């Protein structure tokens, strides 16, 4: 009669990160934007589609940059979240009870 | 033949019948530099 169950309750801090990127716009793009936002008989369709295509290209590049950098940040934090083998394995083997 | 030959996998053969009259020709590429998303705002 000496045995008894034991429980362990670990609680974690959640930490905090963020994201940010640069994305510039020219005034001519905004001007052609203004007519396309009210797309009607006027406003050259070819130029409007050219401008929107170019802007969408740049926007999707800078957007996919986020997913590109997520892997960078995660690999960095795991690299900062590891001890060396030559310092962990000897204790991992040479400690039967403590 | 050329295409069935294994070396042809290093070339992109395309027909250009109107070529003898070329004075001149240029082609353009628009490669851009990908950016890593540094998280903090600078």
């Amino acid at each position: 009669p000496v045995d008894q169950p034991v429980h362990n309750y670990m609680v974690k801090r959640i930490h905090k990160r963020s994201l940010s990127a640069a994305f510039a716009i020219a005034s001519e793009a905004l001007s052609l934007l203004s007519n396309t936002y009210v797309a009607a008989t006027e406003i050259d369709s070819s130029l409007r589609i050219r401008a929107i295509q170019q802007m969408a290209r740049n926007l999707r590049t800078v957007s996919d940059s986020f997913e590109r950098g997520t892997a960078d940040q995660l690999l960095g934090v795991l690299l900062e979240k590891a001890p060396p083998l030559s310092l962990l394995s000897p204790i991992n083997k040479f400690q039967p009870e403590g | 033949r050329f295409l069935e030959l294994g070396l042809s996998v290093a070339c992109i053969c395309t027909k250009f019948p109107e070529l003898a009259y070329v004075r001149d020709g240029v082609i353009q590429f628009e490669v851009q530099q990908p950016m890593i998303a540094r998280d903090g705002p600078h």
Partner: peptide, 21 residues
């Protein structure tokens, strides 16, 4: 901008060959 287009998705840009005459 009213987009109304597919969100790019690996844009296949076009090679343009220019002829001088």
């Amino acid at each position: 901008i009213p987009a109304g287009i597919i969100p790019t998705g690996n844009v296949l840009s076009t090679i343009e060959v220019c002829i001088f005459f």
